[PDB]
Amino acid sequence: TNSTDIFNIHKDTPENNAATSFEFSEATLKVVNDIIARYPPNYKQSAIIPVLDVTQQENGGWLSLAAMNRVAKLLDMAPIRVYEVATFYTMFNRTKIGKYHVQICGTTPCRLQGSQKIEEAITKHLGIGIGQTTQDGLFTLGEMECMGACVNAPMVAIADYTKGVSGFEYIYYEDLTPKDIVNILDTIKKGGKPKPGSQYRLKAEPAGAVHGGEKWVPKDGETTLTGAPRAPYCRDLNA
C-alpha cells in the first residue's frame, strides 16, 4: 500500500470505470513483447510486474481498471491475479496523480538526518501534505520507506511522467536541505533538469554531512581507494 490509495477495491468514476478505453502504442507493444521473451511460454504469467509498470508509464503514471483488463487479456490470465498484484505493490498507483510524483523516505536513518524538516519545507512551499496533489496537477507528494541511500540521507526520489515510457526518468536526489529541495522543485517548475544524486558530493565516498538537517558541514579525513587501480592478476590454478 501507499499514499493516495485508501481503497483496495474498485471505485466508480467518469475517469476510471468499466467504460474506460485504453490501448497500447506500437512502441509499447513491441517493448512488452520483447519483455515477454524473457520467460518461457508455458510460464507466460511471470512477466506481469514489468508489463504493469510499462502500462503505468504509458497511461501517464497510474493504472486504470481498463488497463488492468487489457494487461490480463494480453498475458492470458485471470483479472483477479492482476488486481491482487496491483494492490500488492507500492509503486503501482491505482488513482490519477500529477505529472511529477515526489516520494520521500520516512525510515529512521533518514528521519535522524532531518526528514521531517524536508517534509515540512515541502508542505510549506508546495502547499500540500502527504497524499495530496497541487491544484495545477504538477507535483504529487508521497511518503516511502528506505530507498537504499542511507549514507546520503536525507534523500528524495521524483518520478517523471511528462515524457512517457521512452522519456520516463526516476532520479534520486540526495544530501538535501530545505533550500536544496526547494531549489530542485523550482528548477523542475521552470523547465530545467536538477542534478541527480547528492547535492554536495558525487557518490557514497567519504565527505562532510548534514548537521541537524539544515546545513552541510564538510569534514576531512582518511579516504580509501585513492591510489592507482590494481592490475589484472590470477594465481596458478594447477598444483
Binding site: 521473451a37 524473457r38 520467460y39 518461457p40 511460454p41 508455458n42 510460464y43
Partner: protein, 164 residues
C-alpha cells in the same frame, strides 16, 4: 505402554462395567419392556439406531465416531409424530410421548449396546452404518510442495532464452 485417555474418571467407569457376575446378566426379547410398566403400544413404533454425522458447519470431530471408545455416540430415535400450532399463540403443539427422550438421553458406546437395549425392551430397530471418513489425500496437492511443482504447466521450455 498403555495410554488411552488415562487421566480421568473414565477408567473408573471402564471398570465396574466388567465386574464378574454383574457382566454375565442377560434378558430375553421384550422382557425388559414388560418391567417398564409403560403402555404396551410404545413397542409398536420403529426406531433408528445410528450415530449422527459430523456437521458441515465445523471442523470439530469430538462428537463423532472417531472418538468412539471415548464417549457413547450411538443414538436411538423415533419417527416424528403429528404436530400443529396453538390457535391463540402459534406455539408448536404435539402429543408424542417419545418426542425427545432419545435425542437427549439415549447414548451408547457401540451399536451392539443399542441393539441389546432395544432387544431387551422389544423396540424394533434399524441399523445404519455411518460412512467412513477418508484421510488419504488427492494426488494433486498431496504434499505442500505439490502446490509449486512442475505439474501446474509442465517443465519450462528453454526456447525464449537469448540465442535460443
Amino acid at each position: 505402554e498403555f495410554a488411552t485417555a488415562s487421566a480421568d474418571y473414565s477408567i473408573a467407569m471402564k471398570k465396574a462395567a466388567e465386574i464378574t457376575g454383574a457382566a454375565e446378566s442377560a434378558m430375553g426379547p421384550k422382557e425388559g419392556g414388560f418391567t417398564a410398566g409403560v403402555p404396551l403400544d410404545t413397542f409398536t413404533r420403529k426406531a433408528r439406531i445410528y450415530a449422527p454425522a459430523r456437521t458441515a458447519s465445523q471442523s470439530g470431530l469430538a462428537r463423532t465416531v472417531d472418538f468412539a471408545t471415548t464417549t457413547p455416540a450411538w443414538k436411538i430415535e423415533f419417527e416424528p409424530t403429528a404436530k400443529w400450532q396453538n390457535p391463540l399463540m402459534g406455539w408448536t403443539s404435539s402429543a408424542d410421548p417419545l418426542e425427545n427422550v432419545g435425542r437427549s438421553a439415549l447414548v451408547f458406546y457401540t451399536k451392539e449396546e443399542a441393539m441389546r437395549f432395544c432387544e431387551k425392551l422389544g423396540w424394533e430397530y434399524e441399523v445404519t452404518e455411518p460412512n467412513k471418513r477418508r484421510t488419504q489425500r488427492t494426488k494433486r496437492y498431496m504434499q505442500y510442495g505439490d502446490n509449486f511443482g512442475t505439474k501446474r504447466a509442465g517443465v519450462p521450455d528453454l526456447s525464449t532464452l537469448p540465442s535460443n
